[PDB]
Amino acid sequence: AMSKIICLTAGHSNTDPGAVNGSDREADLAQDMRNIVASILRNDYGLTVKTDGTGKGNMPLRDAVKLIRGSDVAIEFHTNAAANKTATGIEALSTPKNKRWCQVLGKAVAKKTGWKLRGEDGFKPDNAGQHSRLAYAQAGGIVFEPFFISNDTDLALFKTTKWGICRAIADAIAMELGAAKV
């Protein structure tokens, strides 16, 4: 696990913040997910994590893809959104190579939240995907959408259990890599 490289990035930016629900912005939620998961992987496990920093995300695709290629797992955090404010659940978009990783991530979040796993236990393939960062998924990264920002109830749960959810994600990544806590 100490030879492994985990890439974590955040979708969207301060100027183009993705989906919004009130004063909650996708860009901000994605920044929190990337930062918290990164910090736990580094602190609790001493693992190598490469990121697009601690600020907002939306690293240029060219640069992102270079990071994807240099890593063992690469995850960009996003929130889902629908006009239907009852739409709910967890999904991760990637190539079939990454199905197991998508399922590990999705299950980690489902256990903590009771949210529904969409797709195949949280996996949706790139060949059928529609996304602003579909190119990231096509390149072998994972576009992870743990919840719909448009779902007020799920968003409230996320906001009240953010650190616990992100710890579940970090712990699941470490477990899959066989990394013990340090």
Judge contact between 11 and 27, C-beta under 8 A: yes
Radius of gyration of the chain (CA): 15
* Tokens found for residue 134: 């579909």
Judge contact between 11 and 55, C-beta under 8 A: no
Binder to a second copy among 4, 5, 13, 24 (CB under 8 A)?
24
For Zn ion, which is the closer residue by CB, 134 or 156?
A: 134
Q: Is 114 in the site for a second copy (CB under 8 A)?
A: no
Q: Compute the distance between CA of residue 106 and CA of residue 49 in angstroms, rounded to an integer.
A: 20
* Residues of span 41-100 touching a second copy by CB under 8 A: 43, 54-55
For Zn ion, which is the closer residue by CB, 11 or 89?
A: 11
Q: Is 146 in the site for Zn ion (CB under 5 A)?
A: no
Q: Which of 83, 38, 82, 81 is nearest to 57 (CA)?
A: 38
Q: Is 11 in the site for Zn ion (CB under 5 A)?
A: yes
Q: Is 106 in the site for Zn ion (CB under 5 A)?
A: no
Q: Compute the distance between CA of residue 86 and CA of residue 72 in angstroms, rounded to an integer.
A: 35
For a second copy, which is the closer residue by CB, 39 or 88?
A: 39
Judge contact between 77 and 34, C-beta under 8 A: yes
**How far apart are CB 62 and Zn ion at their closest, in Å?**
19
**How far apart are CB 159 and a second copy at their closest, in Å?**
5
Q: Is 18 in the site for Zn ion (CB under 5 A)?
A: yes
Binding residues for Zn(2+): 12, 26, 78
Q: Compute the distance between CA of residue 77 and CA of residue 141 in angstroms, rounded to an integer.
A: 11
* Tokens found for residue 19: 């989906």
**How far apart are CB 156 and a second copy at their closest, in Å?**
4
Q: Is 22 in the site for a second copy (CB under 8 A)?
A: yes
Q: Is 13 in the site for a second copy (CB under 8 A)?
A: no
Binding-site ranges for Zn ion (CB under 5 A) = 11, 18, 78
